[PDB]
Design a protein around this ligand. Sequence first.
Ligand code: ZMA
Length: 271
Amino acid sequence: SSVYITVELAIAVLAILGNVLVCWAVWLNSNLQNVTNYFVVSLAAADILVGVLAIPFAITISTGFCAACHGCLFIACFVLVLAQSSIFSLLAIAIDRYIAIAIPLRYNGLVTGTRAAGIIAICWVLSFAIGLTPMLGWNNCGQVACLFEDVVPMNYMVYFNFFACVLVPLLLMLGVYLRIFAAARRQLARSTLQKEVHAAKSAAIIAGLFALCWLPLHIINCFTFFCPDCSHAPLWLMYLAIVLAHTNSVVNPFIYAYRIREFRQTFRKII
Ligand SMILES: Nc1nc(NCCc2ccc(O)cc2)nc2nc(-c3ccco3)nn12
């Protein structure tokens, strides 16, 4: 009840602060202004919105406020566009690291700032289409009361959101990271190579923390759908899963500060 609201507010504040610090650090320092950091600040902007908007939206869904069907769908499905945007950003970082390690010579030619920003724009406009899919159609609406179970079809969340828009990119980026580390093993000039591995491990960890926090919620949703006969998951368990999913937005500034020395130095300069 009140504990859920307090923890959601704390998570929102921490995520907003950390990701604003990350964006300010990237913008302030020319050394950090790489291509991978463009995807990093895209994911940081996704986390910022998760903190500013998605968490209050989840609180409102918890309170069960009444509103119009379209507004209710926007409230319920806003988190999905940000989660998909984060998926696309992590996939972009994985592909960028694969290009940087497997073919370092042609990395500059293949990977350019204009291409990076274009790819970010395409990923952000595709994520909104995927996450807001229940808004246009594929809806279970029939002032409708707001419940994520009611106004959002489980099948869209259990098939389209999870098996296709989440699991497939997650498996692709898993394969990409395993290929990255296999190529790093084959390639072993030594100081430059260990920086790429240290940079690949930094990226591989935030990608893991994402799958660690978001998949519990999706597995609970699948158990709700694939086994209707079994009792619905506990409400406290549901709130805990939501809290775990929203806590992923908080973690990765800490990972950046802990692993990357440049990020820590520019954070200290800002702080
Ligand atoms: N299944 C589900 N439920 C909720 N909230 C409903 C909480 C609830 C659950 C059971 C009940 O009897 C009454 C209320 N939020 C949810 N968010 C998500 C989600 C976000 C991203 C992927 O799944 N799934 N999800």
